[model samples]
Target: APNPISIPIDLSQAGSVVEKEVKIEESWSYHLILQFAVHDRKEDGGLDGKRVWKFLGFNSYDPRDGKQVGYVDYRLAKSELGDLIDETYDCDGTVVPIKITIHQINQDNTKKLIADNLYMTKGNGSGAYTRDITTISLDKGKYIFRIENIEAFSEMIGRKVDFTIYINKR
Candidate 1:
């Protein structure tokens, strides 16, 4: 119950893949949350190139006992990389529609698809960087969270995007 585990993201690995391995001791009454925060560090704290949420590519899968117990395949519009334009010129999700597929690993693989969502990202809409929160109630065991650098897409080891992942429990 201390600080959440952290991950460092930067330009060195632009538009790359990150797999986060986590250990959950129990799941009976425990809750879990994940966040994505992207910063636009400009003089005057520019909010340009930022929006409420942008989806380059996103996903969450809980594979326990080898049946994909929990899965989340979220897309803004089923577009690939480099397909959408930025919000104010570099933020592609400021005005994107959303489709969220969330559920369990039932024998028939059933899930709920919704337009209005419980998931979202943060942006400097009023004084912040782009951030989103994901809550996937975890089951006891080890799980890997998948992170994709869909936005910013920092190109070089020099150009950077300081992205971090957090974990907290009761």
Candidate 2:
């Protein structure tokens, strides 16, 4: 068990008392673009925003046949930030039915799952899917975040979607 420190001294000797204080603060911000594929919806007749596309065994407009899959790598250092406090994902528009996951890259060059199977669906009658993650504490290391599309729905497709990762520190 850990215990607080207590110092005892003799005041009769007229010695000075030294007090030390330690403070901890939280502050963090991250802005990055996750561009999977490039396609013109208006020119391709998929600009109606009511069609569905498939990628990586899932269906969505962001990761189409030509676009790159939403896999991103990031490194965090103990000197940079204390720990990851919170994280959220925001899609540019109403491209719902998506999946997201977070993983830690081990020293052996293998991936260890931190967060998984995060499914985002359209809101009530809003037809929008935005996801948020609040419970995460990671040590200084390399990590990967991935966003994927779901294939069950036939809504909109061919739109270039931009997914943003928002992170906080503590």
Candidate 3:
């Protein structure tokens, strides 16, 4: 196994780093929107806050050598369980088909994928879904949501990225 050189690199494939993307040269972008409400009672994380929405796309790139996707990191306390959320994604055959993944970061910083492959395809186009937050964790935990592409991105064919996913929650 090849070790990462201090920085991040792609290891999702069979020894393939996918591709290298520079900041100015890459052509992809994503827009994700989330609107939701959770049960927040009493004192909160130091102070207080609100829920919101997310996504990823082209034209801009990542600092790594692979997997140029968007990320959303949120927290759910012991009182925030059993809440409902609305999730949505974009779809286009010409460009990268975006995928959203949810992970839980335990106290030990051990990450666990709670949900994955949440994306819409090209055939139907329109997409949206309901998500109950209870399935991932019961106690207090930190959540990380990843927005990535399913297929290889091409500058010739996938350069024209016009996408936006607005997810309204409950």
Q: For each candidate in the order shown, give its overall lDDT on alpha carbons.
A: 0.34, 0.33, 0.29
For each candidate in turn, give its C-alpha RMSD to the true structure in angstroms: 12.7, 24.0, 19.4
Can you write out model 1's per-residue Cα lDDT over 56-79, one digit (the tens) per residue?
222322211122222223233233
Q: Write the per-residue lDDT of candidate 2 for residues 1-170, one digit (tens) a residue.
A: 11222222111122222222211122233222222333456677542222222211122232112233333222221122223211232222233344456677778979787766534332111113222212234454566765555443322233334454333332
What TM-score fits each model? 0.36, 0.34, 0.27
How does model 1 fare in lDDT?
0.34
Backbone clashes in each candidate structure, one number apiece?
A: 8, 9, 13
> Which regions in candidate 3 have their CA more than 4 angstroms from the true location?
1-96, 122-141, 152-170
- lDDT, residue 15, model 3: 27
Whole-model lDDT, candidate 2? 0.33
Better of 1 and 3 by TM-score: 1
lDDT of 3 at 43: 61
> Ten-residue segment with the worst summed lDDT in candidate 3?
129-138
